[PDB]
Symmetry: D2
Subunit: 190 residues, 4 copies
């Protein structure tokens, strides 16, 4: 069956050394795996959803503005996809199976039309990749669970700034959400 891979916030501001809200080394370490798994999913016929923070510096009505420094600002290089994943987007961004969705909350579902697009395509399984494991990925996974999706987490293609938080989230995915943990070849991990 055809699935959907969700690419969560893997942008310059979350990954690069000078990124405004960078997760640093652990985020950079998944660059090869996240691009590889995305290409693999696309090649086999899956839908690809880039779900990307789209913030505005002067937005005092957003509770998040008080919690983190400005990041992924609309019209800035901070929103550019990091590494070879960006090259994949140059090659296939205009394809009918590839989507770019701006989001304001951590979850890829919140205030977006992600659920609608998935339901149009009768997709029952989402495959999650990106950063941070315990924030945008976690919120997306919980929303996916409540919306009745089967969930796959690409373990080597998610990362957090805190190793303990990364480990909590992975445990939560498997034990509470019943997610399948998979590698960069989309093979289950035992």
């Amino acid at each position: 069956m055809t699935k959907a891979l969700i690419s969560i916030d893997y942008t310059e501001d979350f990954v690069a050394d000078s990124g405004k809200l960078t997760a640093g080394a652990p985020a950079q370490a998944i660059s090869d795996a996240i691009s590889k798994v995305t290409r693999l999913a696309f090649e086999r016929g899956d839908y690809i959803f880039f779900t990307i923070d789209a913030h505005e510096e002067n937005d005092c009505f957003h509770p998040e503005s008080k919690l983190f420094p400005p990041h992924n600002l609309i019209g800035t290089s901070g929103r550019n996809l990091y590494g070879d994943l960006g090259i994949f987007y140059q090659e296939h961004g205009s394809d009918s199976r590839v989507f770019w969705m701006d989001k304001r909350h951590y979850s890829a579902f919140s205030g977006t039309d992600l659920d609608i697009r998935l339901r149009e395509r009768r997709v029952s399984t989402v495959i999650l990749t990106g950063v941070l494991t315990d924030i945008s990925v976690l919120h997306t996974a919980i929303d996916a669970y409540n919306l009745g999706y089967d969930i796959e987490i690409v373990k080597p293609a998610v990362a957090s700034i805190w190793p303990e938080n990364h480990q909590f989230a992975l445990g939560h995915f498997k034990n509470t959400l019943g997610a399948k943990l998979v590698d960069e070849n989309l093979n289950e991990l035992f």
Copy 2:
């Protein structure tokens, strides 16, 4: 109390003579009232949400594609706001209290972040304007009702192709949704 005015699909494709899905004369007849009530709402400090159909011609996954001819296509003049309402947007579009939201369903809430933006601002009352009364306006109103908003309908600033459908919708707003019917001066109608 600060309210929000929702401006629904009042574009060239729904209003102009040559509009791809035009409501024709009844839609054109509300041009003065819809621009007047929007400027009045903006001047008093209300939030203004332009919630506009954003369709793609090649979208075989959208059930609406089979129901209506192509309308409000991306990058076309069909998506331009009709009359003085368009002029108002050119003057005040970049103001912090004015919003543009692309939508794919009839309802202004479906797959958008309208509810999120309204709740950020603690808005309890929505004021509905636009076309068509029995489709995009009706769906928006029903969603607003289920989301617990108080509803105001600007009767002289909503219109449909079918008079019987326009009349059904107005009756539904008042008797089933408990909406207040108001004029272009935002005064209740008796």
Copy 3:
């Protein structure tokens, strides 16, 4: 594949002569068709969801309280299913494919777990029956549309007190929601 039939508000208070918010004769006229189509859907292996108004008197926080007289009050006979449809529920209510869901808004989806139950079963098509065509049925249909369900409307198994409103709703289902209008044999009209 396996579809779900939604049975909307077909209770004493909406149908019977003495019903608190009765649609009267037009609602009573669909009794045979609504019971027949529900029994048919169940025989075909479909899921059946009874989605029924569950109101409380003196619920001042509900906006509907000011719009309609008290109806379908919790613990009252007004919530009893009307006619042979009630007999069907007595017979098959304990079956794993048959559900009873209390609702407070007109739409069967609003504040309920209907969508969750349907998605658990990977249901892609809902079949709508009940009353009123232009209120609870219409709201349920619109929610179903926005939630990406294919929709079937059993034309002889929906009713309103207002003929013009019933007609509007049927047109809206077909032309705006892209719903299939079907008969009591579940054949397209």
Copy 4:
């Protein structure tokens, strides 16, 4: 200023020594604080929502069935509120400001009418209590955040079976959700 206290899954099966899915001693340890803070909120005129797991044996369509042993089964003692909280419910459950809501997912919002009831009362702040901090409480908190509620967490009135998961969740509430941590007297903890 009228708030709503949410009492999440504080029942025999999650708390009692012989509970089917018991969090054990840490859950038992909060019994005094959770009952005290609930009685306080009620005295202050707040709404009280008991949001309680309602599961069925042989519910093969529920993904949770494969993740945890049977717990909080409808019609069983497992669903009984633990400690003085249960006594409070006997005393005041029939009050108009006190609600009992059955739920099937971890989040108190998922498939329930919680949001609807809160919006009816124009509640803007939810106060969270119960178990487990990193499951039902966490999911409820994340849903509350996405739905635009201000969040208070009663720190001494939430618990998990795993202390490290409790710590993660508390950090997540404060740093990611912008929640206020409060004590059993509803005073902010600094």
